Write a protein that binds this DNA or RNA. Structure first.
Ligand SMILES: [K+]
Ligand SMILES: [K+]
Ligand SMILES: [K+]
Ligand SMILES: [K+]
Ligand SMILES: [K+]
Ligand SMILES: [K+]
Ligand SMILES: [K+]
Ligand SMILES: [Mg+2]
Ligand SMILES: [Mg+2]
Ligand SMILES: [Mg+2]
Ligand SMILES: [Mg+2]
Ligand SMILES: [Mg+2]
Ligand SMILES: [Mg+2]
Ligand SMILES: [Mg+2]
Ligand SMILES: [Mg+2]
Ligand SMILES: [Mg+2]
Ligand SMILES: [Mg+2]
Ligand SMILES: [Mg+2]
Ligand SMILES: [Mg+2]
Ligand SMILES: [Mg+2]
Ligand SMILES: [Mg+2]
Ligand SMILES: [Mg+2]
Ligand SMILES: [Mg+2]
Ligand SMILES: [Mg+2]
Ligand SMILES: [Mg+2]
Ligand SMILES: [Mg+2]
Ligand SMILES: [Mg+2]
Ligand SMILES: [Mg+2]
Ligand SMILES: [Mg+2]
Ligand SMILES: [Mg+2]
Ligand SMILES: [Mg+2]
Ligand SMILES: [Mg+2]
Ligand SMILES: [Mg+2]
Ligand SMILES: [Mg+2]
Ligand SMILES: [Mg+2]
Ligand SMILES: [Mg+2]
Ligand SMILES: [Mg+2]
Ligand SMILES: [Mg+2]
Ligand SMILES: [Mg+2]
Ligand SMILES: [Mg+2]
Ligand SMILES: [Mg+2]
Ligand SMILES: [Mg+2]
Ligand SMILES: [Mg+2]
Ligand SMILES: [Mg+2]
Ligand SMILES: [Mg+2]
Ligand SMILES: [Mg+2]
Ligand SMILES: [Mg+2]
Ligand SMILES: [Mg+2]
Ligand SMILES: [Mg+2]
Ligand SMILES: [Mg+2]
Ligand SMILES: [Mg+2]
Ligand SMILES: [Mg+2]
Ligand SMILES: [Mg+2]
Ligand SMILES: [Mg+2]
Ligand SMILES: [Mg+2]
Ligand SMILES: [Mg+2]
Ligand SMILES: [Mg+2]
Ligand SMILES: [Mg+2]
Ligand SMILES: [Mg+2]
Ligand SMILES: [Mg+2]
Ligand SMILES: [Mg+2]
Ligand SMILES: [Mg+2]
Ligand SMILES: [Mg+2]
Ligand SMILES: [Mg+2]
Ligand SMILES: [Mg+2]
Ligand SMILES: [Mg+2]
Ligand SMILES: [Mg+2]
Ligand SMILES: [Mg+2]
Ligand SMILES: [Mg+2]
Ligand SMILES: [Mg+2]
Ligand SMILES: [Mg+2]
Ligand SMILES: [Mg+2]
Ligand SMILES: [Mg+2]
Ligand SMILES: [Mg+2]
Ligand SMILES: [Mg+2]
Ligand SMILES: [Mg+2]
Ligand SMILES: [Mg+2]
Ligand SMILES: [Mg+2]
Ligand SMILES: [Mg+2]
Ligand SMILES: [Mg+2]
Ligand SMILES: [Mg+2]
Ligand SMILES: [Mg+2]
Ligand SMILES: [Mg+2]
Ligand SMILES: [Mg+2]
Ligand SMILES: [Mg+2]
Ligand SMILES: [Mg+2]
Ligand SMILES: [Mg+2]
Ligand SMILES: [Mg+2]
Ligand SMILES: [Mg+2]
Ligand SMILES: [Mg+2]
Ligand SMILES: [Mg+2]
Lengths: 206, 134, 263
RNA sequence: CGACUCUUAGCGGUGGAUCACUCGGCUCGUGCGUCGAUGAAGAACGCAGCUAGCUGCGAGAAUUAAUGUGAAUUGCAGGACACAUUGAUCAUCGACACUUCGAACGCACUUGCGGCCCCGGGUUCCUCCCGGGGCUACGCCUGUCUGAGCGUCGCU
RNA sequence: CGCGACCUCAGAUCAGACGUGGCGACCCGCUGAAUUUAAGCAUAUUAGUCAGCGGAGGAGAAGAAACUAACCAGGAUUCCCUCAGUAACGGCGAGUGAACAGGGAAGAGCCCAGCGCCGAAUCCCCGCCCCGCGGCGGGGCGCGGGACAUGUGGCGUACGGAAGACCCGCUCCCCGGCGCCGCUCGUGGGGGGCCCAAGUCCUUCUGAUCGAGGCCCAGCCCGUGGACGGUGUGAGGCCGGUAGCGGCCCCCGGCGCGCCGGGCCCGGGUCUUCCCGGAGUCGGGUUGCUUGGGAAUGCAGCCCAAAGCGGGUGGUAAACUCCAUCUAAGGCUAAAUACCGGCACGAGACCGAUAGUCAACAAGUACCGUAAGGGAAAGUUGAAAAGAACUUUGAAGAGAGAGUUCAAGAGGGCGUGAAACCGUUAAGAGGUAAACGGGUGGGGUCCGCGCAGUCCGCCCGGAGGAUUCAACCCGGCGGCGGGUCCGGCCGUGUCGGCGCGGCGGAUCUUUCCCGCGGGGGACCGUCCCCCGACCGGCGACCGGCCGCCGCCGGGCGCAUUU
RNA sequence: CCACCCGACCCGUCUUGAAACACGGACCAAGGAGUCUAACACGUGCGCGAGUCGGGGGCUCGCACGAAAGCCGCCGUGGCGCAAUGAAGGUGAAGGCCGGCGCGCUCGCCGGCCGAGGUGGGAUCCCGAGGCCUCUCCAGUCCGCCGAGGGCGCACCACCGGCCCGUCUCGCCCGCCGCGCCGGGGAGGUGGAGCACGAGCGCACGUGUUAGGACCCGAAAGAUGGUGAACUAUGCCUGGG
RNA sequence: GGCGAAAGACUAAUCGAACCAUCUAGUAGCUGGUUCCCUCCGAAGUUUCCCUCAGGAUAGCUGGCGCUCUCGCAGACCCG
RNA sequence: GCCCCGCGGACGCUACGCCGCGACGAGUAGGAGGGCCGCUGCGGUGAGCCUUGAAGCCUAGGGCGCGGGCCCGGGUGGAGCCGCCGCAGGUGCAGAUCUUGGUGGUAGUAGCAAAUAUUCAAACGAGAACUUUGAAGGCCGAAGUGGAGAAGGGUUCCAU
């Protein structure tokens, strides 16, 4: 029964909710268990990076997030092809590969191609046989530099280009931003009915 | 403070394990201090009490300097009977009175092959801990 | 309580007309249990009223800023001898508050060394007070692994542990806190400010980095500065006695006018 | 004057509150996460010197072997080769053992009735009788053997 | 006629294997209510939930797009936060209700059929020998058997693939037994066993003590051990234990290098040419269920029934057109996730015998019901049985003495022992049932224990005694004052300047460096340090010095004083 | 404990009305009923503040306490708040004076200044003629209180005006890569949970409201799956009288 | 559902729908109960709407929390 | 000259404290405040209490508080317990034909009345209306109060 002024509420408690209640008393225990597994995995895979293989830069979709980049699932086959890395070899040396991803633009492709090349320079490759090295990193390089890289490999950061202050030209001062948007919307809205009418008069005249 | 996560501090648990301990564990529970001369001789502080061990009662109504022999180790009752530690029942029968082994001091040990092996284990370990403390 | 408690029975009400209360009653016969009330909070063997649930809200959130403020107030009160003594910390022979000792204490390895140092700094009387407080708890807590209760002693605060914890852990009443991770539950036991704390030099020097000053922010916290006083001068006596206040006041009226008996 | 009745106190009963105790619950958490035709889960019956229940065990029956341990077990008794150090007891448990019913398996569920093979006995030399051992369930897979078909063909 | 081959079938206690049933907390596939809410009730809700059936594993299922999107695009599955009580559904009522993007936990990818090419290059069984060798097998052999061209294996799968030519770079990988043993494997690989500090000192309390006091010099002693339990209270030091990258022994496993029993062994690039895909399935209609999915989200039945520049999707039915995006109708796959059953284990602001599980006990027991099923009550002597010898009355139950014990005023359902109710004793009372409020009176019990009952301060008088008072001197301390006493310092401000000082900055950088951006610099802000002048003030903190005052100790003061 | 005088019916409950010939209650002990979770509202306390908040995750050689605590900042993703309005496409909160003009709308272009309008009330604050007085007179200084009267006016209230969005009536003017079935502007009304120099966020407590067993006890009923023909009903078989 | 020479009879003391367990602590505008003390304030049975008339929503009546202001003085004393 | 024959002059002000003046005081349903009212457990604290006697319980003992309640004495008891500052809740009973356990008045009452019937003597025995033996009087009356079975019971059979 409502009483005086209040919000109309519809609590979703008409089923046997008490039978399905997930408590979180094992949350501290879960965090401990995940931590120990991370540490155990890192010791097992040393000196390979603890977080995992390197991931590519990808741009988040939709208008809400296209201004930001993040780590992708894996490098595309085109990116690996340009970088000169066989897709089968990439996984063994710590490069994630995503055959599903396609590069729509060349800016994204070059960003990840550069990321792969810069990763390859940073990579220290131990010989399969310690006594015999063929094309692996130098003994000196392996002996000292090799250490387990903690945290994401080459974290993906949103870079912002600084734009220095400048004198406003006459053209910029005369640019009508509001009217440009208003007409651009109408041009897109009426483009078809204009193509229909313009076409319709064409056979009318001819 | 206890730090082992696999060792319990529970009062109910420790009492349960104590009062339901099997006999061979009850042997360890029924340890008694050695006398000063024995402690100095063997470098051992305590031994599990055995029948045919001479002891002194150092606590209770029968406390004194008399050296008596342990005639029965009743592990099920956690008590020992000593040869002169007795009392007079109503009808005149003489019954031993149970004394907890932690309240007696061994003055003479019944040495055989097993006790000598046990004694040299405790003394080797006590000495090894000195090589720690130092 | 168990969710099944009080309901592991097929009891059913006899209804009216049988000269008994309409509570559910156990079915069957041939035993004492048959015909007895069930399911009720008022019935022997029934379910308590509103059985306790595990999804009670046990835990509480406190804002990080409010948690940090409490550490600042606790630390500030630990430097006031009136407030430390008010916590019964026996510091009458302590040379100074706050009590700071050289960093080689962090390297102590033996409990004898820790005991001797507490004697030299005249903090041992607090440990002896802890010993005198060792007693048995009153009530059901004795059956629930809380038999012995004692009092809180000095709180040793260190920066880097090179053995200090092992050396002091066996002394009753001693709480050891890393300065980087300060605990309000340890610094203000019982919710009362003014626990006697002993600092090492390194831990003491780090406090301006952990909590900052009013002129520079903390360097070991992303965004924290010390809280602001809403009363810079707390000495109420000096303010009232000050000539600025006195010249503004009216003359006090002290003549007590009592009831006049009307004749 | 007593009874009787009531009230209050002392003491005695009747009753089992209260307090103290707790080898039991409840809740949370952790690690592991393993049953069975090589007979499970469950059930029945039996097993101790005295023992009915509980417990343990299976005709080797309140346990065998082994390993660890190191002098008990115990309510009473008995055994100095059954009172043991040449190993009591306890623990572990990897060896051996493990009755009947039970998915339950010859059939049937009455300790009802068979069949096949082998061994011993009845002087067995046949039949037959007794005892003992092995086997004899349904479905299904691969393979083997024996076959069926006016199914499709080949040769004569 | 018959003899053979195959096909389709059948029998066997044929040789060798496999399934059944259980548990079921969590998981998968079905089936599936009504109570209830809607203030009635039928759609709705309850709920794809309970009950019912089937199938598993330590996880299960899911899973590498016939995906999301519409962006500068993301990129298997699962889980968490958020999206969000939202879009949507709904007698548009009650009510119901996802997803994508984003941030995380985890992260792993792959295999067939087809299409081709390779002399079936393939597999199972059997027999023998040799070697590792509880059957796990490796190889060799066999004019041994069978499967199999109605298609086994190698290569290859949508990320393309194959062959040929030309170029470039090469000799790898794996499994089982070497030995020695490298190895926080993470709290020191795992499992089992056996050990490891220090008071029973002195005095006393007590039935017993673990109580109390003491144990020179900070010292009873150990403490990496002051968790816990036991022991006649209440124990770090009596005992087990506890702490310890403590010891010893035994067993088990992965890794690390070390001959072999052995197998296995080419790759990448470019060019030319060839090859390229899952059908009573998709899709359509209709029906029923389902969903937030709304002119139909998913599923199924029936009918219709494909295509190959096709097909699916693109959240409003339809036609045309462009574009985007994937490639269905075959299959495998760890992790992150779940776990009221089980095997071990730890803990708790929980309960404390009418509570907590029904069950602290010979509890799913006794008992009840034909049965399915229902289902209790019930803990405590004492430190130790020392469980009351013996005498005496009685047929005995039961008493009276005696005895044990600190206690039987603990005597075997025995700690404590309430109330209701009863017996007895003492006191009081009693014909308007009792009881009750207010007021007094009488009696009784006990208390004050009263029962000679104000002390405190000052002054006066008598009668004593003294470490004797004031003042002054010498030490020590303290309070207050002196910042135009001196250090120390502090508050703030200006100038120059220090540490390339630190940190930040949506300031600038063709000084300059290199791979088209990061560096490194300048500036600004801030802080920190230092350095001269200079700066108000010293309960912010602070010493020395001086002045005053006060106290204390010592000296003198030796009596009209104190 | 008893006596006497005055007063004095049995409580709980429902009820207009209970001592009731209304119901429950023989007696005593122990147990016995507004809880907890989610949501929402307001009020109060605390922190920070145009922000606020890590709750999920991670780091700290996990682990008596500690399953705590501390930290993160290119972990603030995200929530709520800072912007409303419309069904939606969408649009989206600043004006007043000083001039120089044009136009005659009552407006429009330019430079300036200022910077969230105005009116009535308004805690507080500011100024304040005049006053009060010392042993007296001459004029002064420090220097409080009284003060008519005036001024700046917090918050808040009311009223007028203004700004944004929807909608309507009216009427002209302007823009250009889109000369368009294009885009923008004014004025007068009216609809909005808007603006008009922010007040929120997190945490805690209380009270109320609700969904939940929902303060406790209580139906007649409904559903699912099972157990019963040892009584009895009926058929059959085989016996007895 | 059975069974009924029919009485809604009988179907294990149960029959106009057996018994057992579960759903299920089913719902109840209805009946009963709802546990310490003192202090201060203190009602309503009326309005409107409701398949409403033993119930609610609504306004009234209540309490709690406030907040916005108004009103002080000749005076340590006495004294406009 | 401010001080000085005298060197001194009560209490106060837990400011959440203390003090003064005036007016007021009914209360169901209901609201709010205070509680040094009460229960259980947790963090602090009381150099708290306790085998020289804790909790509990009893009390014609002594008192305090308007009250909720509390303190103390005595008795009993035999191992634990409490104050204060905060925290937390399964926190306060007279009722619910409340739940479970116990106990009364009724009350030494109703009742121990269906089917004809017992008596004498002896034995054993502590004890005899009731057992046994003997004697007498009776009944069942062969459709039995007789002798044997089925079902069901499950040792009830027999001896001591
Ligand atoms: K043995
Ligand atoms: K269909
Ligand atoms: K009496
Ligand atoms: K009533
Ligand atoms: K009545
Ligand atoms: K509620
Ligand atoms: K019979
Ligand atoms: Mg990760
Ligand atoms: Mg427990
Ligand atoms: Mg339940
Ligand atoms: Mg009655
Ligand atoms: Mg219960
Ligand atoms: Mg208590
Ligand atoms: Mg405490
Ligand atoms: Mg009594
Ligand atoms: Mg009794
Ligand atoms: Mg053996
Ligand atoms: Mg038969
Ligand atoms: Mg066979
Ligand atoms: Mg199965
Ligand atoms: Mg479990
Ligand atoms: Mg309804
Ligand atoms: Mg209803
Ligand atoms: Mg209805
Ligand atoms: Mg459904
Ligand atoms: Mg189910
Ligand atoms: Mg399994
Ligand atoms: Mg998995
Ligand atoms: Mg694919
Ligand atoms: Mg996804
Ligand atoms: Mg939201
Ligand atoms: Mg629909
Ligand atoms: Mg639904
Ligand atoms: Mg997402
Ligand atoms: Mg093939
Ligand atoms: Mg020891
Ligand atoms: Mg003890
Ligand atoms: Mg101890
Ligand atoms: Mg000691
Ligand atoms: Mg250890
Ligand atoms: Mg397409
Ligand atoms: Mg389209
Ligand atoms: Mg596969
Ligand atoms: Mg009890
Ligand atoms: Mg119980
Ligand atoms: Mg029970
Ligand atoms: Mg006693
Ligand atoms: Mg006696
Ligand atoms: Mg007594
Ligand atoms: Mg007693
Ligand atoms: Mg008793
Ligand atoms: Mg009276
Ligand atoms: Mg200061
Ligand atoms: Mg009436
Ligand atoms: Mg009444
Ligand atoms: Mg009447
Ligand atoms: Mg009634
Ligand atoms: Mg009655
Ligand atoms: Mg009670
Ligand atoms: Mg608030
Ligand atoms: Mg924050
Ligand atoms: Mg813990
Ligand atoms: Mg944390
Ligand atoms: Mg934000
Ligand atoms: Mg954001
Ligand atoms: Mg105004
Ligand atoms: Mg226009
Ligand atoms: Mg408008
Ligand atoms: Mg409200
Ligand atoms: Mg009910
Ligand atoms: Mg119905
Ligand atoms: Mg029959
Ligand atoms: Mg008939
Ligand atoms: Mg009729
Ligand atoms: Mg039945
Ligand atoms: Mg209820
Ligand atoms: Mg009604
Ligand atoms: Mg209507
Ligand atoms: Mg009516
Ligand atoms: Mg009524
Ligand atoms: Mg009143
Ligand atoms: Mg008194
Ligand atoms: Mg509780
Ligand atoms: Mg309660
Ligand atoms: Mg009661
Ligand atoms: Mg009441
Ligand atoms: Mg009679
Ligand atoms: Mg009679
Ligand atoms: Mg007759
Ligand atoms: Mg006759
Ligand atoms: Mg006849």
């Amino acid at each position: 029964a409502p009483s005086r002024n209040g919000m109309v509420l519809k609590p979703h408690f008409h089923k046997d909710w008490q039978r399905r209640v997930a408590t979180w008393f094992n949350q501290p225990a879960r965090k401990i268990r995940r931590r120990k597994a991370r540490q155990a995995k890192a010791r097992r895979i040393a000196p390979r990076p603890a977080s995992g293989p390197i991931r590519p830069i990808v741009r988040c979709p939709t208008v809400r997030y296209h201004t930001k980049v993040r780590a992708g699932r894996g490098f595309s086959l085109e990116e690996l092809r340009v970088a000169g890395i066989h897709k089968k070899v990439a996984r063994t040396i710590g490069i994630s590969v995503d055959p599903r991803r396609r590069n729509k633009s060349t800016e994204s492709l070059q960003a990840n191609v550069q990321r792969l090349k810069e990763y390859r320079s940073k990579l220290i490759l131990f010989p399969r046989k310690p006594s015999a090295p063929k094309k692996g990193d130098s003994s000196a390089e392996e002996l000292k530099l090799a250490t387990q890289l903690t945290g994401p490999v080459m974290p993906v950061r949103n870079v912002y280009k600084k734009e220095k202050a400048r004198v406003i030209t006459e053209e910029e001062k005369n640019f009508k931003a509001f009217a440009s948007l208003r007409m651009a919307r109408a041009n897109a809205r009426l483009f078809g009915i204009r193509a229909k009418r313009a076409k319709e008069a064409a056979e009318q005249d001819v | 403070m206890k730090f082992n996560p696999f060792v319990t501090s529970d009062r109910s648990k420790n009492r349960k394990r104590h009062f339901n301990a099997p006999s061979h564990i009850r042997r360890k529970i029924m340890s008694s201090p050695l006398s000063k001369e024995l402690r100095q001789k063997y470098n051992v502080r305590s031994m599990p009490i055995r029948k045919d061990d001479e002891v002194q009662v150092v606590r209770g109504h029968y406390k004194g300097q008399q050296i008596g022999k342990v005639v029965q180790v009743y592990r099920k009752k956690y008590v020992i009977y000593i040869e002169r530690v007795q009392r007079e029942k109503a009808n005149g029968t003489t019954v031993h009175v149970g004394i907890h082994p932690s309240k007696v001091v061994i003055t003479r040990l019944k040495l055989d092959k097993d006790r000598k092996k046990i004694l040299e284990r405790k003394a080797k370990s006590r000495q090894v801990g000195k090589e720690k403390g130092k | 309580v168990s969710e099944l408690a009080g309901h592991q029975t097929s009891a059913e009400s006899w209804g009216t007309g049988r000269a008994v209360a309409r509570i559910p009653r156990v079915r069957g016969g041939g035993t004492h249990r048959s015909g007895q009330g069930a399911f009720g909070n008022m019935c022997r063997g029934g379910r308590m009223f509103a059985p306790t649930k595990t999804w009670r809200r046990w835990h509480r959130r406190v804002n990080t800023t409010q948690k940090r403020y409490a550490i600042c107030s606790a630390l500030a009160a630990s430097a006031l001898p009136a407030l430390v003594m008010s916590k019964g910390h026996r510091i009458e022979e302590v040379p100074e508050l706050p009590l700071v000792v050289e960093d080689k204490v962090e390297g102590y390895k033996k409990t004898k060394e820790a005991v001797l140092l507490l004697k030299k700094l005249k903090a041992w009387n607090d440990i002896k007070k802890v010993y005198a407080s060792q007693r048995m708890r009153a009530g059901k807590g004795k059956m629930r692994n809380r038999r012995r209760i004692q009092r809180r002693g000095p709180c040793i605060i260190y920066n880097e542990d090179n053995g200090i914890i092992k050396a002091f852990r066996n002394i009753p009443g001693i709480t050891l806190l890393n300065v980087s991770k300060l605990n309000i539950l340890k610094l203000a036991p019982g919710g009362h400010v003014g626990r006697f704390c002993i600092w090492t030099e390194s831990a003491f020097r780090k406090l301006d980095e952990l909590y900052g000053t009013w002129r520079k922010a903390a360097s070991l916290k992303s965004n924290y500065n010390l809280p602001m006083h809403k009363m810079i001068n707390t000495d109420l006596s000096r303010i009232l006695k000050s000539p600025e206040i006195q010249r503004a006041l009216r003359a006090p009226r002290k003549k007590i006018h009592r009831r006049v008996l009307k004749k």
